[PDB]
């Protein structure tokens, strides 16, 4: 690219205003300097998305009194290291390391780590055939190359046509310094599956098993914490 | 040659009447196979149904409110109260209080779809006409209850609107139409014998990448 880019985080502004005119990119909505060679933390990415200046044009906004099947979205508080703060708030709750609520809403002594993540994808039935071996090798390649996740953290892949499952497992103790967190890889993967790459200049996930493209129709993601949630 | 239930595949059908009779899975209630089944009964079917697929831990968290097997009334509507921990729900079964005098109806639904960018051209006129055709033909919703379609590439919105006073006896409810549509978009047709939604616009097959659904009640939530 002729100008500066941030391959791992398009939610940035890049300037040749760095030392010696080098490229520097800063995160939208927080301002944290971003390492454009590794994944940005989910917390900081959520802050960037909430800060995004939407122009609705002729789209309508949901009413403030409208209900959703989700817990709702929000601009999170992140600590200086980019992690979710354990408490998120005028009403408050505790979250785990992927930002998901793990207590009832009240008025948080630790950030409970999410150490196991189950991603369940149903793809559109297709004439192209593939087996577990193919799927396992391909997802491991994509997690290493696209998300920079070490394959030791892909604990398992399961396949019962047309349902793919990926199990990510990662204890804090298993993480070398700078290792990508499964919680961040899962989030980038989730957004890729919804057709929103968070990368800059890497196209879509474009999942193929034998070069044959798969169309994901339904995504479910389950998060298991190191201590059970307290509802 | 056999009995089917075009509007509800979550049934077992047998020639038992005076005549095909189709009973809902997971409740056994007889089903009217000429109109949409209530979302409440379809959720009970879904919950009453793994090989090498793993099940999530009972302690796993999700980014939604959690799926449950609801209580329905003898007309197949959600009972207003769902339950140890109890709460009130609206007519699409969504919780509207914290954990119930009436079943408050959802009278406006916003469906927000983002489609994959595609080479085939189309515009709002094309989308409006096609989505209105599909909601009448596939989802059996009367035309007046689609209030609006909006398009800012690649986002499509459909607004459904159906006030209690404007819903005739026997009309399909917008909440059931929205549920059938939501499941179709996720690649699960609830119909029997009608294939997929297979959305195509000005001749272009479209792939939906992301669905968001907003429900607005005739009485505001009390949280």
């Amino acid at each position, epitope marked *: 690219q002729d100008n500066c880019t941030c391959p791992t985080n398009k939610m940035t502004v890049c300037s040749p205003d760095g030392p010696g005119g080098r490229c520097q990119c800063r995160a939208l909505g927080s301002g944290m300097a971003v390492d454009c*060679s590794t994944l940005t933390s989910k917390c900081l990415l959520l802050k960037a998305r909430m800060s995004a200046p939407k122009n609705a044009r002729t789209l309508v906004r949901p009413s403030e009194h409208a209900l959703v099947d989700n817990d709702g979205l929000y601009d999170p508080d992140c600590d200086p290291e980019g992690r979710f703060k354990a408490r998120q708030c005028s009403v408050c709750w505790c979250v785990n390391s992927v930002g998901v609520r793990r207590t009832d809403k009240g008025d948080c002594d630790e950030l409970v780590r999410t150490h196991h993540i189950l991603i369940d994808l149903r793809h559109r039935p297709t004439a192209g055939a593939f087996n577990h071996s193919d799927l396992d090798a391909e997802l491991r*390649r994509l997690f290493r*190359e696209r998300y920079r996740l070490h394959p030791k953290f892909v604990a398992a892949v399961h396949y019962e046509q047309p349902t793919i499952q990926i199990e990510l497992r990662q204890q804090t103790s298993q993480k070398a310094a700078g290792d990508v967190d499964i919680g961040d890889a899962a989030y980038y993967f989730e957004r890729d599956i919804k057709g929103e790459s968070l*990368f800059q*200049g890497r*196209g879509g996930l*474009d999942l193929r098993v034998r070069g044959e493209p798969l169309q994901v129709e339904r995504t479910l993601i389950y998060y298991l914490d190191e201590i059970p949630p307290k509802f | 040659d056999n009995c089917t239930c075009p509007t509800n595949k979550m049934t077992v059908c047998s020639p038992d009447g005076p005549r095909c009779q189709c009973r809902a899975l997971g409740s056994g209630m007889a089903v009217d196979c000429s109109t949409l089944t209530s979302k409440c009964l379809l959720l009970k079917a879904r919950m009453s149904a793994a090989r090498t697929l793993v099940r999530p831990s009972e302690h796993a968290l999700v980014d939604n409110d959690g799926l449950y097997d609801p209580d329905c009334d003898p007309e197949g509507r959600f009972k207003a109260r769902q339950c140890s921990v109890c709460w009130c729900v609206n007519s699409v079964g969504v919780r509207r209080t914290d954990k119930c005098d009436e079943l408050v109806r959802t009278h406006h639904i916003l469906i927000d779809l983002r489609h994959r*960018p595609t*080479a085939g051209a189309f515009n709002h006129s094309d989308l409006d006409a096609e989505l209105r055709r599909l909601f009448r033909e596939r989802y059996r919703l009367h035309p007046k209850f689609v209030a609006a379609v909006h398009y800012e590439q690649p986002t499509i919105q459909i607004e459904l609107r159906q006030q209690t006073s404007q819903k005739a006896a026997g009309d399909v409810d917008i909440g059931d139409a929205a549920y059938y549509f939501e499941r179709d978009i996720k690649g699960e047709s609830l119909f029997q014998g009608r294939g997929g939604l297979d959305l195509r616009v000005r001749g272009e097959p479209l792939q939906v990448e992301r669905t968001l659904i907003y429900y607005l009640d005739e009485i505001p939530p009390k949280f």
Partner: antibody
Amino acid sequence: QVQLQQSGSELKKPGASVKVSCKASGYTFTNYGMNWVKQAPGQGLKWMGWINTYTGEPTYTDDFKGRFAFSLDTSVSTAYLQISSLKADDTAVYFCARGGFGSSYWYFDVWGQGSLVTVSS
Amino acid sequence: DIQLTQSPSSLSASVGDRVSITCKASQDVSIAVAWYQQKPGKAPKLLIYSASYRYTGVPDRFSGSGSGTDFTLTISSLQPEDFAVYYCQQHYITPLTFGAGTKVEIKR
């Protein structure tokens, strides 16, 4: 019998235009991107850009834009390379090469045989 | 653009020799490096993608390694059909770029 078949050699005067075709057969054309690679006589490979056959959108590079145009006719599974205002340094073999739509598939598994374009007065 | 420094520009080897060709990227490209072989008058053939994955039908003697900035294509035992030009390519980000090529020639 997955194949890309390109059009034949071309000889053009400076200032002229040329259109090179790349016909796909044996696979679903809109499931893959089509990439264009230049190889001047005696030189190495240079990526010119590509066209997303599903969205129809071309992506050019700094060195190949303006008078280079990538287009498609999906009804006959064909991608085209048009070069206008030809100059002698355009003399080269042009390859089309199939790839995917995202970076973990942006390597080229199936290639055309190449089309030689020679520009001379 | 990501510059690839491919070395050596040429090498002479005998049938039976272990041959290694390196590709240095000007910035970290994960494992997204492909290698191609090209003979005279022919299109290039894909050998390796994602730094170490052999493409269908590519013989076992071709292998790839590396991550980050430094990559290596290895021919574990050169065979008579392997004298050719080899190219690396990065597929980390657009624009896609190539190394300048390595000509593998017959030693005598």
